[PDB]
Amino acid sequence: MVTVFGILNLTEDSFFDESRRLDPAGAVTAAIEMLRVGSDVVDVGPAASHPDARPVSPADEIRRIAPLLDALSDQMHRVSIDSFQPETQRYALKRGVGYLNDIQGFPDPALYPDIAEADCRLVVMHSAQRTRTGHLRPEDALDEIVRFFEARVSALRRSGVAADRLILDPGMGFFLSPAPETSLHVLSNLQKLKSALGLPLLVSVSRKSFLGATVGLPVKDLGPASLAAELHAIGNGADYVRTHAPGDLRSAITFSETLAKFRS
Amino acid sequence: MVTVFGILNLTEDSFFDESRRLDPAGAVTAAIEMLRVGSDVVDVGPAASHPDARPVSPADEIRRIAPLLDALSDQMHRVSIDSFQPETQRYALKRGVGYLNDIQGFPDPALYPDIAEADCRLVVMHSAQRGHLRPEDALDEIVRFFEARVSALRRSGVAADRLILDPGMGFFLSPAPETSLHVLSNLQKLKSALGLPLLVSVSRKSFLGATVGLPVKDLGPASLAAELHAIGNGADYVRTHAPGDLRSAITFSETLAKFRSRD
Ligand SMILES: Nc1nc2ncc(CO)nc2c(=O)[nH]1
Ligand SMILES: Nc1nc2ncc(CO)nc2c(=O)[nH]1
Ligand SMILES: [Cl-]
Ligand SMILES: [Cl-]
Ligand SMILES: [Cl-]
Ligand SMILES: [Cl-]
Ligand SMILES: [Cl-]
Numbered sequence: 001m002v003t004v005f006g007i008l009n010l011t012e013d014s015f016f017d018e019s020r021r022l023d024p025a026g027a028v029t030a031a032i033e034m035l036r037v038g039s040d041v042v043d044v045g046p047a048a049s050h051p052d053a054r055p056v057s058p059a060d061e062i063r064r065i066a067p068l069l070d071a072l073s074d075q076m077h078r079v080s081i082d083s084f085q086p087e088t089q090r091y092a093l094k095r096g097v098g099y100l101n102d103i104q105g106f107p108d109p110a111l112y113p114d115i116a117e118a119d120c121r122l123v124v125m126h127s128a129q130r131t132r133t134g135h136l137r138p139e140d141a142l143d144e145i146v147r148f149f150e151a152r153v154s155a156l157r158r159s160g161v162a163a164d165r166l167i168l169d170p171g172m173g174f175f176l177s178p179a180p181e182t183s184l185h186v187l188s189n190l191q192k193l194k195s196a197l198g199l200p201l202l203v204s205v206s207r208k209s210f211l212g213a214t215v216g217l218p219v220k221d222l223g224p225a226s227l228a229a230e231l232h233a234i235g236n237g238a239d240y241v242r243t244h245a246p247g248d249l250r251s252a253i254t255f256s257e258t259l260a261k262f263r264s
Numbered sequence: 265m266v267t268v269f270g271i272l273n274l275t276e277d278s279f280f281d282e283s284r285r286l287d288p289a290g291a292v293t294a295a296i297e298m299l300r301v302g303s304d305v306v307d308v309g310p311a312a313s314h315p316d317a318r319p320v321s322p323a324d325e326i327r328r329i330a331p332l333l334d335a336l337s338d339q340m341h342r343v344s345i346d347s348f349q350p351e352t353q354r355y356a357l358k359r360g361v362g363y364l365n366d367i368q369g370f371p372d373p374a375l376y377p378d379i380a381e382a383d384c385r386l387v388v389m390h391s392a393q394r395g396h397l398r399p400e401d402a403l404d405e406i407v408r409f410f411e412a413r414v415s416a417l418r419r420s421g422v423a424a425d426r427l428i429l430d431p432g433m434g435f436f437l438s439p440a441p442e443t444s445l446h447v448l449s450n451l452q453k454l455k456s457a458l459g460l461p462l463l464v465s466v467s468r469k470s471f472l473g474a475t476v477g478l479p480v481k482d483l484g485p486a487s488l489a490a491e492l493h494a495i496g497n498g499a500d501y502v503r504t505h506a507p508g509d510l511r512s513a514i515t516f517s518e519t520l521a522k523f524r525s526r527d
Pocket of ligand 1: 049103123169171172175203205
């Protein structure tokens with residue numbers, strides 16, 4: 001069984017014009033449709049990853065996700081909030097979203113008691129931008145990721161966060177290293193990571209730099225390479241996938257699972 | 265190593281308007297372009313596929329492909345002619361195409377001595393038309409079919425190393441998806457039993473539509489998944505509607521495999 005997270009970036013190109021003004025009604029419509037075809041969970045991202053973007057204040061993040069939580073009130077369990085701001089996480093916490101997705105892997109223990117009371121699940125992502133000899137090399141990646149999760153899981157578990165609420169994301173692309181080889185090594189040997197961690201795995205390879213470096217294509221021609229990467233990840237222990245093309249991935253999952261039933 | 269055939273259907277909706285008249289210049293432009301990104305080979309199909317279509321005469325087939333061979337004469341080894349008409353096949357031989365792709369599997373021996381003198385390769389496709397074939401009967405029938413057909417080609421002088429075998433997919437096997445699924449799922453035994461290179465064309469076929477429940481133009485992703493499985497199970501050639509997509513997934517898969525560390 002695979003659970004598909006569909007990416008909803010509230011600050012992507014299609015949500016503003018020359019007035020630099022964001023469209024809340026447009027995002028609500030997109031999120032409803034996503035949940036209708038393709039996305040098991042919609043992953044709402046209020047922070048900008050634009051090269052010139054300044055940090056987004058927590059208050060702006062909350063104002064951006066609040067209208068979306070309003071429209072999805074009767075299906076909170078299909079909502080994930082993609083944010084590293086603890087105040088945004090706290091706000092989404094109390095409103096009862098299904099998931100908190102943190103690229104910093106919840107490093108502030110002052111938020112742990114608030115998380116233990118709630119029932120949401122946590123996507124705990126490893127980020128190698130923590131520095132020793134330099135960038136994360138392939139031969140060290142697996143041990144680094146295991147030691148990272150060993151420490152962060154046991155910290156959350158010490159504060160009352162049950163283990164069955166935890167989803168572990170190894171990180172991909174530049175979150176692992178500027179070198180594509182490190183992401184390729186981790187993805188290819190994902191099964192060994194899954195066995196050593198013993199908890200469900202999520203990956204998000206869709207449109208990442210290391211795909212572009214591998215096939216030599218710009219970010220919007222990476223749909224097919226992403227699908228190949230995702231199907232490979234699913235076959236090697238990934239239980240969750242975060243992707244820009246969720247309906248595409250689901251229909252490929254359905255074909256793969258149906259085809260496996262005919263193997264002799 | 266995979267060779268990707270890009271489908272060029274000369275009678276798809278993009279190549280005619282209300283004049284019911286085919287546009288060869290648009291197809292030439294499409295062919296040159298798909299060769300530039302993705303397609304190792306372009307599979308040129310002049311025979312209609314419409315539900316209300318009558319058969320296409322060989323003269324019309326030849327008229328439709330002639331401008332394409334004109335535009336690709338300096339790279340004929342990258343050209344496959346998708347036709348079952350022996351007149352169209354003879355014409356293509358005379359202009360030295362790289363491949364003859366016959367969904368009837370070359371059943372007319374009158375053509376063999378002309379093929380034997382050429383140096384093209386042949387895509388010999390198996391079909392249930394000679395229409396229900398069950399999964400339990402599928403593999404033995406495909407093997408027995410090719411054993412007779414391959415021997416008959418070789419005995420008329422067509423060398424074995426020129427042959428590419430296609431099991432057929434979709435309605436060429438059965439109206440039910442189960443037979444295509446069984447054959448695709450167990451493609452490796454087919455390859456080892458036949459011992460010749462294998463081509464499959466699953467792209468957009470009915471059995472994908474029935475498996476994922478999607479119309480023919482939402483089948484890109486399911487097709488890519490099917491294609492990647494076929495490649496991992498002995499397919500040396502793949503005929504697809506999205507050749508640039510497939511080549512990019514193959515490049516990623518081949519690169520990823522190099523990072524698998526022992527056991
Ligand atoms: N869990 C997770 N979330 C992400 N959010 C944003 C981005 C990139 O903007 N990447 C990721 C990712 O790789 N994993
Ligand atoms: N070799 C080959 N050719 C085909 N041409 C047309 C179509 C469908 O129009 N299918 C095939 C196929 O499955 N294999
Ligand atoms: Cl409501
Ligand atoms: Cl999609
Ligand atoms: Cl021989
Ligand atoms: Cl038919
Ligand atoms: Cl093989």
